[PDB]
Every structure is written in structure tokens, then in C-alpha cells.
Ligand binder design. Structure first.
Ligand SMILES: CC(C)CN(C[C@@H](O)[C@H](Cc1ccccc1)NC(=O)O[C@H]1CO[C@H]2OCC[C@H]21)S(=O)(=O)c1ccc2c(c1)OCO2
Ligand SMILES: [Cl-]
Ligand SMILES: [Cl-]
Ligand SMILES: [Cl-]
Ligand SMILES: [Cl-]
Ligand SMILES: [Cl-]
Ligand SMILES: [Cl-]
Ligand SMILES: [Cl-]
Ligand SMILES: [Cl-]
Ligand SMILES: [Cl-]
Ligand code: NA
Ligand SMILES: [Zn+2]
Ligand SMILES: [Zn+2]
Ligand SMILES: [Zn+2]
Ligand SMILES: [Zn+2]
Ligand SMILES: [Zn+2]
Ligand SMILES: [Zn+2]
Ligand SMILES: [Zn+2]
Ligand SMILES: [Zn+2]
Ligand SMILES: [Zn+2]
Ligand SMILES: [Zn+2]
Ligand SMILES: [Zn+2]
Lengths: 99, 99
């Protein structure tokens, strides 16, 4: 796949079977998703963005299906206005930014 | 150039001749930079992200030199914690995100 960036590079994905709209985000170290419920096996993590900080719940070894691939990766759940797949997942997928 | 995303894709840009380190960010619609003054001819607008919102000042037709190319693009100034070159600039440079 190739994303030419004239539109947002948004795709659908599944996280532990739960469907989401996600933004492929080279400006994010981590992957942050709102509204999904991954249960009680988490550690708290503090994440900073453009407007300040939020608490998140960090889940490791989560099954992710996106772009016809299946990977296991860390997902943080919390109050992001857009669900983002950051570089932890982009590298797991083998993605690159090119010019 | 290829950015493999194992590390943050950060490069040196010159904005109206001033050097700034910028994050190449596919998750950003717009480009936002701090620490530089671009003057009185702007439009104020609010942007949102993780943590909340910030006020920005939007400037059109700003001289940008980055990745050995020179372009004219829209830049916001505001109190962003990191300087961000979003899709408006990435597309002017001919960048793509690939799997
Ligand atoms: C949240 C996504 C949808 C939007 N953002 C760009 C992101 O790439 C942002 C860019 C960013 C990077 C660093 C600090 C602040 C923002 N990264 C970010 O929030 O990442 C967080 C998750 O992983 C961690 O690693 C980096 C911070 C954490 S943003 O910075 O808020 C932003 C930039 C340009 C914009 C905009 C919002 O609205 C219109 O134009
Ligand atoms: Cl397209
Ligand atoms: Cl596109
Ligand atoms: Cl398009
Ligand atoms: Cl599934
Ligand atoms: Cl933390
Ligand atoms: Cl963070
Ligand atoms: Cl905006
Ligand atoms: Cl010139
Ligand atoms: Cl490819
Ligand atoms: Na004016
Ligand atoms: Zn397009
Ligand atoms: Zn599945
Ligand atoms: Zn959408
Ligand atoms: Zn992190
Ligand atoms: Zn982080
Ligand atoms: Zn962690
Ligand atoms: Zn915008
Ligand atoms: Zn010049
Ligand atoms: Zn120069
Ligand atoms: Zn400040
Ligand atoms: Zn490929």
C-alpha cells in the first residue's frame, strides 16, 4: 500500500476483533485508541500531545489486523480525539516514509 | 530519502531562513512551529490534539527549505511542544507513506 498524503492516511483495523478507524501517524511514538475495551490487564502510562498530557492504559501483546497484516503490539487506550497507529506499529508492519 | 520510522523522522528545516528541527508527521493535517515570529498578517485559529487545544496563528506562503527542496506553504505558529511538518508540507515535497 501507498498513501500520498493529500488525504489523511486513515484505514480501518481490528484490535482484538474490535473495528476502528485509525490514522497512520509517523509523528506518534505510540499507538493510542479511544473507546475500545481491552480489560483489566494494563499498566498506567502518561502520554503527552499538542495540548498537554493524558493518562492511558497500556496493553501489551495485543492482536492487530490492519493492511492485510496481523501483528502483536502495544496499544494504549485513552482520550485521543483520533485513533492513531504510531511508529511502534508502523515499524511492525514494515512501513516507511519516502521522497 | 527514506525514513524507516525506527526513530522519529526529524530533520532540519529553514523557515524564512531560520533553522528549526521539525518532525515529519503524517498524522498532522497542518504544520505548526514554535519559537518563530512570522508577523502581523495571520489568521487566528484553534487546533486540537491529544491533551486538548491550542491557539495558533496561520501564515500563508511561507518560504520553507527542507530535504533539499524549497517550497511555499502554510505554517501555523503556536505553543506546540514540538515543531511539526504536516501533510500540507509533506505533499508539497512529494513524500509518501508506504507499506
Ligand atoms: C493526535 C494526532 C491526530 C494529531 N497530532 C499530530 C501527532 O503526530 C502528534 C505530534 C506530536 C509529537 C510530540 C509532541 C506533541 C505532538 N503526536 C502525538 O500526539 O503522539 C503522542 C502518541 O505518541 C507519543 O509520541 C509523540 C507524543 C505522543 S497533533 O500534534 O495534535 C496536530 C498537529 C497538526 C495539526 C493538528 C493536530 O490539527 C491540525 O494540524
Ligand atoms: Cl488518493
Ligand atoms: Cl492521497
Ligand atoms: Cl486525495
Ligand atoms: Cl477479527
Ligand atoms: Cl509513563
Ligand atoms: Cl508520550
Ligand atoms: Cl485546523
Ligand atoms: Cl530563495
Ligand atoms: Cl511497497
Ligand atoms: Na493584517
Ligand atoms: Zn489522494
Ligand atoms: Zn481477527
Ligand atoms: Zn474518518
Ligand atoms: Zn512512548
Ligand atoms: Zn510515549
Ligand atoms: Zn510500554
Ligand atoms: Zn487544520
Ligand atoms: Zn530564499
Ligand atoms: Zn538555504
Ligand atoms: Zn508554553
Ligand atoms: Zn510493500
Amino acid at each position: 500500500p501507498q498513501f500520498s498524503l493529500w488525504k489523511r492516511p486513515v484505514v480501518t483495523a481490528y484490535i482484538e476483533g474490535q473495528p476502528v478507524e485509525v490514522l497512520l501517524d509517523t509523528g506518534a511514538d505510540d499507538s493510542i485508541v479511544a473507546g475500545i475495551e481491552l480489560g483489566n490487564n494494563y499498566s498506567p502510562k502518561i502520554v503527552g500531545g499538542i495540548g498537554g498530557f493524558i493518562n492511558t492504559k497500556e496493553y501489551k501483546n495485543v492482536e492487530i489486523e490492519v493492511l492485510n497484516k496481523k501483528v502483536r503490539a502495544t496499544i494504549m487506550t485513552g482520550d485521543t480525539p483520533i485513533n492513531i497507529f504510531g511508529r511502534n506499529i508502523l515499524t511492525a508492519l514494515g512501513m516507511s516514509l519516502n521522497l
